[PDB]
Symmetry: C3
Amino acid sequence: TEVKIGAKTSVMKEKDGKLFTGKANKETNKVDGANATEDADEGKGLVTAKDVIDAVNKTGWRIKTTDANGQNGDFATVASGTNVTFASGNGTTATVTNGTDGITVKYDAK
Amino acid sequence: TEVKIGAKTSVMKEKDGKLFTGKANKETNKVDGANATEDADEGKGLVTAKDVIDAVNKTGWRIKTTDANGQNGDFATVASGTNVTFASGNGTTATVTNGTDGITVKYDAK
Amino acid sequence: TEVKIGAKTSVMKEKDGKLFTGKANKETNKVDGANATEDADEGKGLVTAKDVIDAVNKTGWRIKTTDANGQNGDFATVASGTNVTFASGNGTTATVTNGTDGITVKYDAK
């Protein structure tokens, strides 16, 4: 019955919490796409709900982690839905509260 | 004059700062959609600007809050645009600076 | 050969880490769009991959910064991909670890 009309989609790439076109990911970030089409993809195409859901879930800020010896390690992406806890420490007390001015994190010294 | 050609859209669900298809939200997260269509929605459909704006604004990381007694409480979503303050505390001083390496939060002991 | 069928797109605006329709940005945020079309744009239109990539990259949470004298300054947007470091300070030690419960930031007093 119907006439099917194809609308080309574009891919959305992610690296380190940030989104990129297929072309930018290949050319700026030096990450190989799945094929020559992705590598040339300037993002002019449409996207699906699932595409957006998946891409957005990958994004986030980058937090510097520390290693087993407490020294600086790699960044980690604090992606959508990622839990973050500000823990009390030796001789300190952490509180995290929510109000009209947003979130307030605080450390007190014991 | 024109011939109207309908393109089916898909919904984007959110839970705790993360996005989900209608089907995933129902089946993995056990949250009822508005109807059977949403509950079966695998995200193959298109989305509007407003859809994306609204969905993206809901996303964010999750921060552990503390209650009126300073004990661990629920997480809260630090959504797009949410203000976060790192406050100085009893015998501590907070500074938050911005540079080429991004943001640096620091607590000094007085 | 082909018949070209135009699908109207909608713009996605950003302010302070949050997304808005063209109409909302103009009317609620009081920011001029590029033209009368943007200013009336309710987001019913489609978007491209690049549109979503660019808009999503602008979003993030807002962190209160402190100025050259350590006093409260402006907020800054911690956008997708933005690096955040929790630095050890005078008489304190910062650790940031990653586990099954997500990220845990901690300050110990020396």
